[PDB]
Amino acid sequence: RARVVCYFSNWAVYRPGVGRYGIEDIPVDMCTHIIYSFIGVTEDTQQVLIIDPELDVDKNGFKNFTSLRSKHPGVKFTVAVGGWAEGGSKYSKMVAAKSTRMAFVRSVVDFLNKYNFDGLDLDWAYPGAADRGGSFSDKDKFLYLVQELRRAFIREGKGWELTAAVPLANFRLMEGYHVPELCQELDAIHVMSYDLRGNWAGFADVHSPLYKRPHDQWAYEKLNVNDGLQLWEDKGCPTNKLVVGIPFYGRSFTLSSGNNNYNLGTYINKEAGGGDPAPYTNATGFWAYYEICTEVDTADSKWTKKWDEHGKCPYAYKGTQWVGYEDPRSVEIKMNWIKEKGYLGAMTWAIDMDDFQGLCGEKNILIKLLHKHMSAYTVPPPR
Ligand SMILES: CC(=O)N[C@@H]1[C@@H](O)[C@H](O[C@@H]2O[C@H](CO)[C@@H](O)[C@H](O)[C@H]2NC(C)=O)[C@@H](CO)O[C@H]1O
Ligand SMILES: *[C@@H]1O[C@H](CO)[C@@H](O)[C@H](O)[C@H]1NC(C)=O
Ligand SMILES: *[C@@H]1O[C@H](CO)[C@@H](O)[C@H](O)[C@H]1NC(C)=O
């Protein structure tokens, strides 16, 4: 009854060489819930925005994805609306009035019917966030959107699920999330327990520490997976609605000039924007798990690998490059911790960044860990 929630990135198909990851690459049997990311919302009409129509519609992306249920009928296939790149202003605008929300709700219902999805994952980052085009009113109005979507899903009579991806920082919760009301309307809360540290913070650190470290101060004090999930509980979310996010990627940094200190919290060249891009994801500031393991785990690697004893995460560095991530050791620790706490399951961002090619050894090694622990686990009643 535990969940293994797999976010699937529709843009991963454009990665060159062995990075190429399409619908056919999804290890469907390792997941209980798979989420096609992303669709968006239009600025002008508050309707569903199809972001890559040539892929999603013309090449039958949406339907290829949902058709996987023929061979795997136990698995739920949903779609996610939003994501970071979509921005927050169009969503704040969409929820501002009852009329615009109902327009979106209708559009959503038509879309889900048309492409045979099992429901919707909400990925607005974030209601109430001034840095994301949000405002104070978003908190009530996001709740209204959620209530209105749930009611529409009920009226359709197909048992569609409604879920949401959420942050764990307290200030974000206060600004955007009516926790008890949201958790009762949603089938699951996909907690984004990653990107907790990164170039934007001005220092090198792992981005999904499980527990507090000594250098964690002020806003960062409780910004860890354990305390963050505890925060969701304290604000009124039942343990059996909480799904814990696991990143299949690392956050990278370029260290400051002449800096020979590689410890957690060391100063960085923030203007660099992060570590140098890797060959497949091609982005400053992060590496896919498979880009990390092919560099760090080879026999003749010049990388130095270390372990965060409190956060329970690996980090590795070479020259000016520093990357914090998750490996099988750290993932295993989180799986056991999930079961100990009694949470609903594990989520990954994102399945397309696992070592699906087995470049480093075993294919799909990280998702195999999630599946192994969750499939043998019974979620206890709410605490
Ligand atoms: C709701 C939310 O904040 N979703 C986050 C993701 O958007 C984000 O992944 C990022 O998605 C972008 C598209 O919206 C991509 O442009 C970007 O490359 C991608 N970044 C990574 C590292 O995959 C992830 C991770 O930052 O957090 C999600 O929960
Ligand atoms: C969908 O499946 C068809 C038939 O195998 C394939 O030709 C097409 O490329 C697939 N589309 C996507 C987006 O994966
Ligand atoms: C890779 O990303 C960089 C950003 O630094 C961009 O300039 C370049 O066009 C990208 N290359 C490919 C082949 O995607």
In total, the chain counts a number of residues equal to 383
* Binding pocket residue ranges, ligand 1, CB within 6 Å: 38, 82-86, 123, 125, 165, 192, 195, 249, 283, 286, 349
Number of Cβ within a 10 Å radius of residue 280: 20
d(CA 205, CA 66): 38
DSSP strands (E only) in the chain: 3-9, 33-41, 48-49, 76-82, 119-123, 161-166, 188-191, 242-247, 249-254, 286-288, 304-308, 313-318, 321-324, 345-349
d(CA 205, CA 311): 10
Buried b (16+ CB within 10 A) or exposed e, 235-272: bebbbbbbbbbbbbbbbbbbbbeeeeeeebbbebeeeb
d(CA 88, CA 131): 9
SS3 377: coil
Q: Is the peptide bond before 77 cis (omega within 30 degrees of 0)?
A: no
DSSP 269: -
Q: Is the peptide bond before 350 cis (omega within 30 degrees of 0)?
A: yes
Do 138 and 128 form a contact (C-beta atoms < 8 A)? yes
Q: Which of 115, 114, 135 is nearest to 126 (CA)?
A: 135
Buried b (16+ CB within 10 A) or exposed e, 6-40: bbbbbebbebeeebebbbebbbbebbbbbbbbbbb
In the chain, the amino acid numbered 186 is L
Q: Which of 127, 57, 62 is nearest to 96 (CA)?
A: 127
Q: Tokens 């290890």 sit at which residue?
A: 27
**Exposure of 359 in the CB half-sphere (CA atoms within 13 A):** 19
258 alpha carbon – ligand 1 mean position (Å): 32
DSSP 285: T
d(CA 215, CA 226): 16
Atom of ligand 2 nearest to the CA of 63: 1
d(CA 66, CA 62): 6
322 alpha carbon – ligand 3 mean position (Å): 21
d(CA 229, CA 235): 10
Q: Strands 3-9 and 33-41, how do they pair?
A: parallel
**Exposure of 231 in the CB half-sphere (CA atoms within 13 A):** 22
Which domains are delineated in the chain? Answer: 1-247+326-383 (3.20.20.80), 248-325 (3.10.50.10)
SS3 321: strand
DSSP 50: P
Do 127 and 177 form a contact (C-beta atoms < 8 A)? yes
Resolution in A, one decimal?
A: 2.2
Do 48 and 93 form a contact (C-beta atoms < 8 A)? no
Q: Is the peptide bond before 126 cis (omega within 30 degrees of 0)?
A: yes
Do 33 and 63 form a contact (C-beta atoms < 8 A)? no
CA-CA-CA-CA torsion for 254, 258, 263, 267, nearest 10 degrees? Answer: -60
365 alpha carbon – ligand 2 mean position (Å): 26
Atom of ligand 2 nearest to the CA of 65: 14
Residue 190 corresponds to which tokens in the numbers above? 């996909």
Check if 64 has its Cβ closer than 6 Å to any atom of ligand 2. Answer: yes
Backbone angles phi, psi at 272, to 5 degrees: -60, -25
Residue 1 corresponds to which tokens in the numbers above? 């009854």
Do 210 and 326 form a contact (C-beta atoms < 8 A)? no
Q: Which of 43, 83, 100 is nearest to 164 (CA)?
A: 83
Q: Tokens 């843009």 sit at which residue?
A: 11
In the chain, the amino acid numbered 204 is A
DSSP 268: B
382 alpha carbon – ligand 1 mean position (Å): 30
